[PDB]
Ligand binder design. Structure first.
Ligand code: HEM
Length: 184
């Protein structure tokens, strides 16, 4: 179940966030913690491609090796808050599971600057959801969370100490695929 109406950053700069570059998840918190593994790897690219607002996602379970990519065109609900219907693709953008009604995520940018961000997502996959999932992002996959983003975690009435880091999982990413997938 998702339970939070995440508030988007006041003054969110959409063009900076959606600049075509990659964001790495460094830390995450699911309010239903058993919905996701204790060890995980994830990243995304976010950009406008031929006028269309896009995200490309990458998930990797470092223990099971379960791997998947997704592409979505985001619809705007308000500045910094989006609804994304996703398609599972291979790294080259070939469709494995087409877009469908019931497959979407919400995506709220709670805080962002040039290097760091805090997001909330609620994933819906038919009648399943994966809970309220918060993620700390950085442009540098190895960056420890700094004071701007940690303060934003506090401002959301969360505790950064409870987030799970992705940093000790040997995560290696294909940035080229993420960038190219924005067009797909
Ligand atoms: C920016 C952040 C994230 C977004 C927008 C997001 C989005 C999604 C989407 C769209 C799917 C469905 C993929 C498909 O079936 O095509 C998915 C699945 C999944 N995500 Fe995420 N995710 C994010 C971060 C994470 C993180 C950090 C974790 C783990 C800690 C995670 C764990 C999972 C798992 C385990 C699944 C598979 C669910 C299933 O097998 O049905 N995700 N996510």
């Amino acid at each position: 179940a998702c339970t939070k109406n995440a508030i988007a950053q006041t003054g969110f700069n959409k063009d900076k966030y959606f600049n075509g570059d990659v964001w790495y998840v460094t830390d995450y918190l699911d309010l239903e913690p058993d919905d996701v593994p204790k060890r995980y790897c994830a990243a995304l690219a976010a950009g406008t491609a031929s006028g269309k607002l896009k995200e490309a996602l990458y998930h990797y379970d470092p223990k099971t090796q379960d791997t998947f990519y997704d592409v979505s065109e985001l619809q705007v609900e308000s500045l910094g808050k989006y609804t994304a219907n996703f398609k599972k693709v291979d790294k080259n953008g070939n469709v494995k599971v087409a877009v469908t009604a019931g497959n979407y995520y919400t995506f709220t940018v709670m805080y962002a600057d040039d290097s760091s961000a805090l997001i909330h997502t609620c994933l819906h996959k038919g009648n399943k959801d994966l809970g309220d999932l918060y993620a700390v992002l950085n442009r540098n996959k190895d960056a420890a969370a700094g004071d701007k983003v940690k303060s934003a975690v506090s401002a959301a009435t969360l505790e950064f100490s409870k987030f799970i880091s992705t940093k000790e999982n040997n995560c290696a990413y294909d940035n080229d695929s993420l960038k190219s997938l924005l067009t797909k």
